[PDB]
Amino acid sequence: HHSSGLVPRGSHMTPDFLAIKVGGSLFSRKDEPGSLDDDAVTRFARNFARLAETYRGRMVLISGGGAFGHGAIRDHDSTHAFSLAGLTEATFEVKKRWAEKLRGIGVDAFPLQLAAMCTLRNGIPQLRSEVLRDVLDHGALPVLAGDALFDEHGKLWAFSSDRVPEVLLPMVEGRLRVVTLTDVDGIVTDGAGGDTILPEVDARSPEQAYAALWGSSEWDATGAMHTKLDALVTCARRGAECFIMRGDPGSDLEFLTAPFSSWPAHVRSTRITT
Amino acid sequence: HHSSGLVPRGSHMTPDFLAIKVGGSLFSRKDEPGSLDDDAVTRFARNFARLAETYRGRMVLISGGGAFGHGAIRDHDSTHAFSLAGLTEATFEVKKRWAEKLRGIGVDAFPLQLAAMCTLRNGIPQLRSEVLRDVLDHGALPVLAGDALFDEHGKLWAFSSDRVPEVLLPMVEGRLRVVTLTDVDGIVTDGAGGDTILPEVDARSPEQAYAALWGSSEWDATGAMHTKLDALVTCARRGAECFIMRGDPGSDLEFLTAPFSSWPAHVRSTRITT
Ligand SMILES: Nc1ncnc2c1ncn2[C@@H]1O[C@H](COP(=O)(O)OP(=O)(O)O)[C@@H](O)[C@H]1O
Ligand SMILES: Nc1ncnc2c1ncn2[C@@H]1O[C@H](COP(=O)(O)OP(=O)(O)O)[C@@H](O)[C@H]1O
Numbered sequence A, B: 001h002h003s004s005g006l007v008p009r010g011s012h013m014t015p016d017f018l019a020i021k022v023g024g025s026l027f028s029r030k031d032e033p034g035s036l037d038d039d040a041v042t043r044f045a046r047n048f049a050r051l052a053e054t055y056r057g058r059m060v061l062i063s064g065g066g067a068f069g070h071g072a073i074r075d076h077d078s079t080h081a082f083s084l085a086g087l088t089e090a091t092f093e094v095k096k097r098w099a100e101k102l103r104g105i106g107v108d109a110f111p112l113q114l115a116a117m118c119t120l121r122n123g124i125p126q127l128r129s130e131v132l133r134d135v136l137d138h139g140a141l142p143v144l145a146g147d148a149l150f151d152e153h154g155k156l157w158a159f160s161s162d163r164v165p166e167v168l169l170p171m172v173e174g175r176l177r178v179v180t181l182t183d184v185d186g187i188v189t190d191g192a193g194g195d196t197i198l199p200e201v202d203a204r205s206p207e208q209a210y211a212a213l214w215g216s217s218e219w220d221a222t223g224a225m226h227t228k229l230d231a232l233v234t235c236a237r238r239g240a241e242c243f244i245m246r247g248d249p250g251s252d253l254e255f256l257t258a259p260f261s262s263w264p265a266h267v268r269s270t271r272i273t274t
């Protein structure tokens, strides 16, 4: 036994940190190049702004790649992994669009290139720049996304926005809450369209959640729901309280500041914890 | 006296590392939003590619901001320094354009956001990400530019591409050569259009070079030739061999691999050294 700080945890406790990921499904048609739904971005931005005021210096916003990101991966030459470099430019564009919009409504939103801050070592992302912590300590809102990351052999890999919360794990003090907004209400069990949402998944033994999953579409290059589950199990096994739930641009999100047991009764999600 | 490695230096010696900065003047009209001269970019790229093959893992390309960068600074609200955040998006675009072009001709060019890697402390830029060194060690070509950088108090500052070589100084082993390509042949002495180029400046006492300088235009927000001189004096006082010289998109640049005393006789520059 190595000693560590005892962190009080539970459905009664308020999060110390929010990592909110917004799926591309919610503001982009993957099929349509350069699709960004500015109305969706605008409306979501307003809701993210309120969260960012409360979680000042205690939140990151993570954007999916949409048409920009999936397109970069679709269109690269798999025979030279370096052609994935275009992915970093593509996901920068999406971070830019979020950050611009947020700054227009008074949020100190700053896009950061994950590829400039993180590399892979034995498959595990490694935060290698102190700048993310400084930005948060200045009270700003980092806008992040997935990226093309170098490994220790110099090979580029496509690293989904869904996995970005993993990079926060050794950095974030106290209770991390990770919320992945998507186009489904959570992990649906008993049907490749629907039956019922699985309300709780135990990250120590999530075999039933994995049993529920179905395929990625043709348009999807980063593994859809399986990649989400893998990332959120990873985060939950390191103490995070994680959620898959439905995004909606005008939906109020202030309940994401609140302890889970105090959430409104209408809110549906899959919660992943240990 | 603290001991350090004795580095052989002189006009007879070949550089171990090349930092090539390409001024916005050379591929953008600052006055014209979104001006990027694709023919200039294409032609320069071809010449930079040959350098990058020889200096594989031993070179950075640094782009000026042109219309994108100067525009971001022109158009920000000086009453909230955070509105400078748009600068990081603007100079990312320019890095993207270079990197795209270079990759199209077989160079492993990867844009990196300086703001994600570097902060200011007591006015001195501090490299805070290990990713730049890794990228170079993988044999890739970092494409850099100026940026909006956070200081230790959370204030954003516009940091010119001209100063980017300063960030390399504690990282680069051996002989660094810094070449700033601009729209003049060097530091002109005896006239606010021309008289003669100052061929050599001693960084230990460069008072005559500073005496030669004239103003920034209306369009220029990062201090024109004075900022170049300040950056290159800084680098030279830490051992770099620095050059201000004229850029031209089709000009062959292979002589930039070569010891200074072996350069062609037609080449004009201001050389700054200690
Ligand atoms: N068991 C499941 N429950 C819910 N969604 C699932 C399941 N299995 C696969 N999926 C798919 O995962 C999709 C969400 O992932 P994805 O398409 O990548 O969206 P995002 O844009 O949020 O990353 C859903 O639209 C659904 O089609
Ligand atoms: N003594 C000098 N010698 C040469 N150029 C000078 C001098 N003083 C000022 N300058 C100005 O500096 C300019 C180059 O800096 P700048 O406009 O910022 O170009 P860049 O795009 O390379 O950064 C020249 O075009 C010139 O007008």
Ligand SMILES: [Mg+2]
Pocket: A023, A162, A222, A223, A224, A225
């Ligand atoms: Mg996805």
Ligand SMILES: [Mg+2]
Pocket: B023, B162, B222, B223, B224, B225
């Ligand atoms: Mg300049």
